[PDB]
Amino acid sequence: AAAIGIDLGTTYSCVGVFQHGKVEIIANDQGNRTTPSYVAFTDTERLIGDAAKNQVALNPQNTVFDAKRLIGRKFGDPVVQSDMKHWPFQVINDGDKPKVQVSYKGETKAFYPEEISSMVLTKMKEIAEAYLGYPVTNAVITVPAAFNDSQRQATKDAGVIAGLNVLRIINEPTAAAIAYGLDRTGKGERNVLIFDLGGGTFDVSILTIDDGIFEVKATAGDTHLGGEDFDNRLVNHFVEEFKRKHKKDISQNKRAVRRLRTACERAKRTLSSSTQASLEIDSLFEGIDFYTSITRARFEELCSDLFRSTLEPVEKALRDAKLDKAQIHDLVLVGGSTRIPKVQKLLQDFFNGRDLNKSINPDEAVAYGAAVQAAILL
Numbered sequence: 001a002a003a004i005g006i007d008l009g010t011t012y013s014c015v016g017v018f019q020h021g022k023v024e025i026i027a028n029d030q031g032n033r034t035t036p037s038y039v040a041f042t043d044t045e046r047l048i049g050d051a052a053k054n055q056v057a058l059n060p061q062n063t064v065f066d067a068k069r070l071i072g073r074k075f076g077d078p079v080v081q082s083d084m085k086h087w088p089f090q091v092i093n094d095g096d097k098p099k100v101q102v103s104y105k106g107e108t109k110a111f112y113p114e115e116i117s118s119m120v121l122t123k124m125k126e127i128a129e130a131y132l133g134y135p136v137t138n139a140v141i142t143v144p145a146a147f148n149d150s151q152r153q154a155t156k157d158a159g160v161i162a163g164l165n166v167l168r169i170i171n172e173p174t175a176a177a178i179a180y181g182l183d184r185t186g187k188g189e190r191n192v193l194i195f196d197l198g199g200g201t202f203d204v205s206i207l208t209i210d211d212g213i214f215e216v217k218a219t220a221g222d223t224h225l226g227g228e229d230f231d232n233r234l235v236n237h238f239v240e241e242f243k244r245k246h247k248k249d250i251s252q253n254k255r256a257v258r259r260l261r262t263a264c265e266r267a268k269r270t271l272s273s274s275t276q277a278s279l280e281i282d283s284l285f286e287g288i289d290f291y292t293s294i295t296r297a298r299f300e301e302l303c304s305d306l307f308r309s310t311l312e313p314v315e316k317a318l319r320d321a322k323l324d325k326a327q328i329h330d331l332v333l334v335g336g337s338t339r340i341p342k343v344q345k346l347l348q349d350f351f352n353g354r355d356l357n358k359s360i361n362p363d364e365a366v367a368y369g370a371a372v373q374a375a376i377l378l
């Protein structure tokens with residue numbers, strides 16, 4: 001019975017398994033190789049993953065996301081106090097722990113962040129069991145390098161609630177290095193840079209690996225910079241375009257903005273492999289259809305300042321590690337936003353043409369490495 005690797009991300013999660021000498025990343029029921037970290041509560045059902053994210057515009061008060069931003073924290077944590085201003089669901093205080101309060105089956109209910117994350121993990125466990133044909137009981141689960149003991153405990157709790165024996169909680173940059181086999185070196189220091197740009201967060205880690213032992217030399221980044229911010233630049237662009245073609249400002253209509261946002265996220269993904277993308281939204285605002293298009297070059301202009309901003313944390317990490325650009329042996333791309341061609345060009349140019357490790361889909365590389373480690377531990 002194989003153990004699984006699970007990357008429990010802020011915006012998406014991913015599961016892999018190592019068997020028959022290789023990793024497979026497991027697609028969900030819809031064929032998607034990652035699954036939104038979303039849970040929705042209705043009058044009759046609990047929805048998780050794609051089904052929950054697909055109805056967010058219809059049920060914003062009872063659709064929970066961003067639980068990783070709360071997990072293991074106190075209610076009075078300044079991070080919790082700040083983040084809650086921007087969520088459409090209610091957060092409450094229960095013994096200085098935060099809980100998310102929703103309507104579910106006609107009653108008011110509240111859940112700890114680890115309970116929300118346990119539902120995401122249950123879905124990832126079910127995705128793996130559908131592929132394998134038998135129940136999964138052991139897993140390695142990943143966390144950010146900055147997580148403290150309480151955040152690590154609550155993540156482990158989420159896994160046990162989901163019915164997994166948690167073999168280990170390991171750092172995301174460590175898992176990404178394992179995916180590329182960077183910890184097999186032997187005697188000799190290797191300096192590795194992990195550049196992780198996800199849906200909601202940006203993390204740079206510099207690791208020194210010596211005889212299979214990992215040392216974090218420096219970390220940098222921005223906890224509120226990710227693909228969602230690129231989506232938002234596209235939304236604002238199309239809001240201005242809809243004003244031109246229809247004389248109407250749709251920005252105060254919550255429904256229309258959320259649906260435009262979903263369409264922008266899809267067009268953005270297309271622009272990673274095509275030079276143009278079409279937007280086709282029926283009945284966007286006031287029954288009016290919105291059909292338009294955008295080029296990859298225009299998208300890069302709209303985000304040029306955000307893309308460029310990722311290089312300053314790299315410079316800072318190198319200064320803190322007391323390393324020059326040329327001393328970094330391997331550059332590893334992690335996170336779905338590193339699939340954007342312009343982001344790859346900026347990092348490669350900054351490193352004066354060095355190779356990028358990107359042969360594993362960047363949004364899957366952490367789960368890939370977690371699955372390898374789970375097999376090693378078993």
Ligand SMILES: Nc1ncnc2c1ncn2[C@@H]1O[C@H](COP(=O)(O)OP(=O)(O)NP(=O)(O)O)[C@@H](O)[C@H]1O
Nearest residue numbers: 009010011012198199200201227272335336337363
């Ligand atoms: N091909 C693609 N091109 C561009 N963006 C993409 C692509 N595929 C996925 N994304 C984006 O990548 C983001 C999700 O990355 P992912 O690494 O899966 O999230 P995560 O694991 O939750 N990381 P984080 O939110 O920072 O904790 C979303 O903004 C997606 O829209």
Ligand SMILES: [Cl-]
Nearest residue numbers: 028029030049
């Ligand atoms: Cl599914």
Ligand SMILES: [Mg+2]
Nearest residue numbers: 007009012366
């Ligand atoms: Mg992830």
Ligand SMILES: [Mg+2]
Nearest residue numbers: 144201202203
């Ligand atoms: Mg992160």
